[PDB]
């Protein structure tokens, strides 16, 4: 029987015509998360509650409902229950949910639980905004020049988990097929060879890029850059770029800039000309360091997005405070983006900034922009006040060391 | 008939027992390169000649022999001759060669010429050393902490170029096979879907990692880090890491550090304990910025190596002066690692540092360490003297702007 307790006081969020109908007392499911999730989640719940209390003068209140996935799920539901069917059901049912870090066990043949949540709920958009918070210790000279929003495709690519082990009957069957029926000659060593499949479809590309352009319009952003490796992988990465440009022309009236290949899309609300461009992935990894100001909204495939989001997060000193969301047409799951750091679990020491900023993305998604704005204001003030957790403090002079919970308070104090 | 002219005075380098037998007058084939290759190559030839002249007091001299590939090949041999069979023959025959930037035409279905050279000559090692040259304008606060050597697998991965276009009969045939015969259920959108194959074999992994460990030993380096995405791609990326560790244990007497997974390999020459470790690729992209000093020799797959080498190059202000080599068991091809920058072609303006440093790797490979040391010394002095090309000068105050050829001279002047 389920151990999830539906809050007595609280109402389910609904969806109509692609628009969320959020009540003043929405029930929001939440997954504590493994390791440090035990530290960061409580801080997040408190910070969010303070923000909504302050924003709406007590008129609104979230009814938190704990659901399970990861190590805590096995302890709650038993041995092999890492991701209960009900968790997928609950998230879809309640439309909006948030979670702490999740880790996948090894030795049992289980694949990434985070990817499982994304794929099964068809949360095709991995949204990762990366900006700099003044006062954050950064390894680069000008982190303030970074203000990007990453739209990472979440349902395709080699991330789909389609592969076969070297020397397995399956791997041999696939390789035999490729060489004998497809006439593949480029497999250098066909024996003791593992094989992986990289898919990229038009509908997959289009829906991701459509969300990216709509975001640029809704937020009056300057450009959308399609990042890819089309010079090497023409039919997957290259096709992604092609379809992205095509979508811009076919659905957003994209016009040609100069002699190409860049396009301009008129923002139907502000009249601003949004530039649609593209950059090779490896070169992009260099450009984000050398010319970050030239970039804004980014649309890319799964793997590249993973790399880009992490590299960007590192550069602005936000490795531990990078917010993230997994969005689909029916529901959305916000999440801490860092690891579980089991060594510090329960020490009330780690930075709760990632899950908190992911909660602010959640609040904004719910249309509760005022509360979200309060969290941003709180984070900015606390960091600028140099009252921070160890991960920041260690790289600074004259900073006040704060525990995880205390930093949560500092955020509230700066709202 | 061939238009390649074998130098009258000069002798072919030979190979015996995996050791190059280099004469005092070796014939070295060279490809000018497209675009700025017309600017950088002449500077390289002059710098190298000055270095060997100075090092061996006139006793040794390279007999340069021009060979063709790229745009110049079509102009020399005709319309469809982008990569002549003789070029592959010449490189293998003469054992050591160098080249400027190469570009691949689009619209003709031709795949990367650089990859073609690597694959066809089985140059399985893409060696990319990245260090900081004092005085180089860098976007990071402490670029001097970066001193890494990248061993990028060059014959496998999605880089192999195995893929099929969306809606093509082939793509449909492969997808049908995967779904109906392999029972694949993770292809989100099977229609209008491009497909790519990612292979990774044991022999491919082992030979790359073997070269990496041997390099760490020969150069008394501190560690070898296997970079991979094994948490997501278990059978390719994960297998690479597994085989890498296995090779360390089976061939280099690797012993377990603590409770694992790190290993220690005793340097048979210095007694130094070389640490063998591994890091997830996305996290590595962050670690190179946050903790670069903890890394040294890196061994990774094709695509990841491409990303890692570029990101590292950018961080140390070496985007345009990053040396590179493609090494195999029978021959080696050194190359400029940047693009062709056609806009500046013939202006004697671009930085010849990349091809020059690649020539120093070439000289060292030939056993001409003294000449190679002279080039390093020259580069260090010129950069530190702030007498540089526009790409550096633009990011500095109080620097003396030098043309491409003039920077070549500056290098010579600092030998
Ligand atoms: Mn990640
Ligand atoms: Mn490259």
Swiss-Prot record, chains A, B:
Broad class of enzyme this protein falls into: oxidoreductase
Keyword Protease: no
pH dependence: Optimum pH is 7-9. Exhibits maximum stability at pH 6.
Activity regulation (record text): Inhibition of this enzyme by phosphorylation regulates the branch point between the Krebs cycle and the glyoxylate bypass, which is an alternate route that accumulates carbon for biosynthesis when acetate is the sole carbon source for growth.
Cofactor: Mg(2+); Mn(2+)
Recorded consequence of changing residue 159 to F: Nearly abolishes enzyme activity. No significant effect on substrate affinity
Pfam families from the UniProt entry: Iso_dh
Residue(s) carrying Phosphoserine: 112
Chain positions with N6-acetyllysine modification: 141
Binding site for Mn(2+): 306, 310
GO cellular component: cytoplasm; cytosol
Protein modification: Phosphorylation state of this enzyme is controlled by isocitrate dehydrogenase kinase/phosphatase (AceK).
Binding site for D-threo-isocitrate: 112, 114, 118, 128, 152
A GO molecular-function descriptor: magnesium ion binding
Subunit-structure text: Homodimer.
Family: Belongs to the isocitrate and isopropylmalate dehydrogenases family.
NCBIfam families listed in its UniProt record: PRK07006.1 (NF005425), prok_nadp_idh (TIGR00183)
Chain's role: Catalyzes the oxidative decarboxylation of isocitrate to 2-oxoglutarate and carbon dioxide with the concomitant reduction of NADP(+).
Stated name of the protein: Isocitrate dehydrogenase [NADP]
Organism of provenance: Escherichia coli (strain K12)
């Amino acid at each position: 029987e389920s151990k999830v307790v539906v809050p007595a006081q609280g109402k389910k969020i609904t969806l109509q015509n692609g628009k969320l109908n959020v009540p003043e007392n929405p029930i929001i499911p939440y997954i504590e998360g493994d390791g440090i999730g035990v530290d960061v989640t409580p801080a997040m719940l408190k910070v969010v509650d303070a923000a909504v209390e302050k924003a709406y003068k007590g008129e609104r209140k979230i009814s938190w409902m704990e659901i399970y996935t990861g190590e805590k799920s096995t302890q709650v539901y038993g041995q092999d229950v890492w991701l209960p069917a009900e968790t997928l059901d609950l998230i879809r049912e309640y439309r909006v949910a948030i979670k702490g870090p999740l880790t996948t066990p090894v030795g049992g043949g289980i694949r990434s639980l985070n990817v499982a949540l994304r794929q099964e709920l068809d949360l095709y958009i991995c949204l990762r905004p990366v900006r700099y918070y003044q006062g954050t210790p950064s390894p680069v000279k000008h982190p303030e020049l970074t203000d990007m929003v990453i739209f990472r495709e979440n349902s395709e690519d080699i991330y789909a988990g389609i592969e076969w082990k070297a020397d397995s009957a399956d791997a041999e069957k696939v390789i035999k097929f490729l060489r004998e029926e497809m006439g593949v000659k480029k497999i250098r060593f066909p024996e003791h060879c593992g094989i992986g499949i990289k898919p990229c479809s038009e509908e997959g590309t289009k829906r991701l890029v459509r969300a990216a352009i709509e975001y640029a319009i809704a937020n009056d952003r300057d450009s959308v850059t399609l990042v890819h490796m089309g010079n090497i992988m023409k039919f997957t990465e290259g096709a992604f770029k092609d379809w992205g440009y095509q979508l811009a022309r076919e659905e957003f009236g994209g016009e040609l800039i100069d002699g190409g290949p860049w396009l301009k899309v008129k923002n139907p609300n502000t009249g601003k000309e949004i530039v649609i461009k593209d950059v090779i992935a490896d070169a992009f990894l260099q450009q984000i360091l050398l010319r970050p100001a030239e970039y804004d909204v980014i649309a890319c495939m799964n793997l590249n997005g993973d790399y880009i989001s992490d590299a960007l997060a590192a550069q602005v000193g936000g490795i531990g405070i990078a917010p993230g969301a997994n969005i689909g047409d029916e529901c959305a799951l916000f999440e801490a983006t860092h690891g579980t750091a089991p060594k510090y679990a329960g020490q009330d020491k780690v930075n709760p900034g990632s899950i908190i900023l992911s909660a602010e993305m959640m609040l904004r998604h719910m249309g509760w922009t005022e509360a979200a704005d309060l969290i941003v204001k709180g984070m900015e003030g606390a960091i600028n006040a140099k009252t921070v957790t160890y991960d920041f403090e260690r790289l600074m002079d004259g900073a006040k060391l704060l525990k995880c919970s205390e930093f949560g308070d500092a955020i509230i104090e700066n709202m």
